[PDB]
Amino acid sequence: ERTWEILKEDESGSLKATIEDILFKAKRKRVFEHHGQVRLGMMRHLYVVVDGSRTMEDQDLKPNRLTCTLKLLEYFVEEYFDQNPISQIGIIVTKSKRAEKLTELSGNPRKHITSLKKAVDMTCHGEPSLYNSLSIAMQTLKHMPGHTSREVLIIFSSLTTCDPSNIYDLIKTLKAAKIRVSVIGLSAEVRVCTVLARETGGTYHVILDESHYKELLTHHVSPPPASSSSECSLIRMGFPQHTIASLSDQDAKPSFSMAEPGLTLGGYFCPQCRAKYCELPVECKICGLTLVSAPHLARSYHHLFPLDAFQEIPLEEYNGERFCYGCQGELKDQHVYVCAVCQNVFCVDCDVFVHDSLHCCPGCIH
Amino acid sequence: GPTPIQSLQYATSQDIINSFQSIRQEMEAYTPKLTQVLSSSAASSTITALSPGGA
Amino acid sequence: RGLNRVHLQCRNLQEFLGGLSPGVLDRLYGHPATCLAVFRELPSLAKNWVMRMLFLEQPLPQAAVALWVKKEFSKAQEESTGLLSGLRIWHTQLLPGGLQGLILNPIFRQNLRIALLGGGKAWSDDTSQLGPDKHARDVPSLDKYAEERWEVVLHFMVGSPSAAVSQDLAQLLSQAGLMKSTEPGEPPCITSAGFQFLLLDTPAQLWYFMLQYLQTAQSRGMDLVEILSFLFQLSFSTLGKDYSVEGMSDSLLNFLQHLREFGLVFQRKRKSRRYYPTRLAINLSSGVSGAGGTVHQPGFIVVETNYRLYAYTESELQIALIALFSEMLYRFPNMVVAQVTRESVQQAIASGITAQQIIHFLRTRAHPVMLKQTPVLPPTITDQIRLWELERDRLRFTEGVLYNQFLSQVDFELLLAHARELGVLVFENSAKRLMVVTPAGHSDVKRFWKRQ
Amino acid sequence: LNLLVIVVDANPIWWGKQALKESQFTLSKCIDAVMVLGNSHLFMNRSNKLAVIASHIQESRFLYPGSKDGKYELLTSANEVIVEEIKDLMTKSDIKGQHTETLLAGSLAKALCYIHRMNKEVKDNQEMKSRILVIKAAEDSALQYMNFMNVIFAAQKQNILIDACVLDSDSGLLQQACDITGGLYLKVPQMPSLLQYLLWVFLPDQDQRSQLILPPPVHVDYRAACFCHRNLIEIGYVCSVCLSIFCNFSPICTTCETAFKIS
Ligand SMILES: [Zn+2]
Ligand SMILES: [Zn+2]
């Protein structure tokens, strides 16, 4: 007997029209987090584990957990490749006390997202089997090279899981295998997953809101840190140049990529096996030599030397120009950002866009 | 970056000093003009180069 | 009612100028601003090619120019080509050997060039070194004044009190066919075209209203080219800056007085020689207000799926417009509530208003909260609004001459062949040997029927 | 709605030699074309918007934003501020050798963040499309490759088309940016007629690139070399720790404190 009277004017005079001013911070956000100059698992094999159990039908979020999960998964899949084309993805669904590898080890969002679209039709059935899921995953990761960061991300919806044997078998194996596992839980903290994640070197987090769900996923987009226990390798890599059918396709037959059915007349050949690949980067399914484009390498070098947060202040007390450096414009906002090194004037968009998207400060390049 | 050695080469300090001076002096003595903007001969010649059968 | 309902033929710049004489257009192209107005109105196809060709005096071959656009878009490029040539912008010149070279009218070329870069005149603009004017007028005061003036003209069509206008302007509203002369003394009355105009948006309204003024301009002895050039210079003017009436012909002075009375320009006094152009004049161009609430001023009609209209408007004019096609339910100080219904929309339809006018009228005035969605008007409303006219716009009338019951099929096939020969065939029935021909062929075919 | 962002290689070294060379084409004629081109962008559409930045040896100066004298407003005000800004920059010029490269990356960074503000400032009823036109004349400075590559991907993520016009000296980085961003790289063979190339290759709208027939994109060879002896590499070895490229196998990262675990 309180909801029709729950407005701010229920027991106040000024709240009759200042109610949305008193409760004005109702829907906003402001994303930022820390960083560190530590080794990163730039070569990344991340596998996604998603509950396929009846509990995924619950409406803890706006739509059922399944729809909200798949919605954010697609977005996460996109940015994961976008921020690391070198890495690869795979998906496993934990249904009927069993686990089904929705997607194999690959780096093609086309196939991965296509699988998601189709996976929207899945049937939430039975209880989850964390042991079966980790079995299929580890069985696959066993064959992956030690230097490639073998990681798994788990999305847990239920609280009870059917394991055919104590998961300590897998955790002891995973720890010895140096594989890393992280888990994202829905509405609750489970000891099983917490111990599993903390012991395995990953982290257990719980979803609060779709924004929090993105906030957590955002952290998993950045490559994990690496220790000296992982193989510090000197992996062989190919940088094949694109080659069209320039000579009227002469002595250059069109061919389908190892992964694709599209017969491409021009593209990237394998310097190791001369295979035809329409896209790059692509792993040589018939050689083991990975082929990567020179710009994709530089695309990740920001993680090696990222920017630092700029000095924030409510006013340009330093009395720089009335026009914000970088992007020209008036200091219309009573909050200013100043680079520690170059000390130029930066605005809200500069601190956000330059540090989170440009990753380079103009005055530091000078 | 991981780029091979370019064909870059420095000049003489005189050329640098003269470059800073000559360009400063040119920009001090400069005004926009339609004739300096374009000529039909230049445009047509450039159209030939850009034509569907051009170089 | 031998033909369909009278429609307000909205003729953009192309349709209007497309009928003018080349010398008139050449005189019009005399000013740089007139060229820019024409140029900016061109489709992006023409817009680029003209800019690309502006710096040449060599007749580029028709084929090479046409080969600048991809195979599939070359067909759409023909539209811009037909326009540029039809608008005298493109004139063919012959290359050695008679090849079809293309050249832009040098006057237009030179004025666009003088528009972009210095020329003998500095855009025909000057400050006259005068200081800040007496009784300074502010930009918002200019907008409101222009708005008030425009509202007064719309109010005059609505026939509301205090709508003060000159009889020559009231006459023009009747002369243009907007205010019907159904009664002596010209009491407030409106034609289908006038209602369509009332529901039309401000820029298209002002545009077509001024086109009617121009259609009567030489009947009124005003200078078409001069007024047009002046109007284009005004469209390229600035709100806050001052402009002078120095060196303006009496024809321009008469028009300027109308232009002032019309609220497109603000003057210190009718006799003053310095003025400030209003937002309406700067925005006076053949363009579109938008698919939702107007960019310049937001909409106020909250159209709802239950056909309920919640117009956050105080304006008796806007309210009275809503009453034309919708049944009004309540009047509240800050907002008005109404509902669209078959009867009220059939009133608009019977008054000769295409449902698209209502749809667009509501769209252009759709409250900003209704935005942020692809369809601003729910499909059910859009469909039923159209369905109401499609219910009662199935009967289509057409005046013609019928040829029937000939002596044989040879007569029918001969008359049909003659109708086909002259292209005067409207419709025919080959089973009963019936043919309908345009009325122009009435005498020709009636007399031929005696000869065949 | 569109926003053109012109970038001119305000390098006094090449332009000064070009001036000292007394060639048929000079910086004066160049800025004339730029101003006319800039005018054309705004002239082409009442709603179009434009910004111009000059990449100098030590500063990325905006050339917008126009003058208030009122002789002519739209084009004259823009041209006057442009002349004034280039004069201020080039007349009040210093002389330095320690840092002689053109601040290209900084200029591009300014443009990108400036575009970001503007596109946010624009209402969402209709959205501002944007593209950058880079007019390069001096040599391609490798020391900015890191920043250059990072800004390319930012433009890509921001869905911004980048076009480039190179005078004399070419650029692998800039041609690579055109390829990646989906723009176009062109080496102008007749610098005095620069403007005519601009009014046809770089002036057409994004919505018209697809409709016009233009010179096909030059295929860019992704030549790469390791930091060790800089030789060309088609197949090399990469440090999974720091991604430093080494042409041939070795025990330790010369680029960092890390001994490879070799087996
Ligand atoms: Zn291979
Ligand atoms: Zn800095």
Ligand SMILES: [Zn+2]
């Ligand atoms: Zn290393």
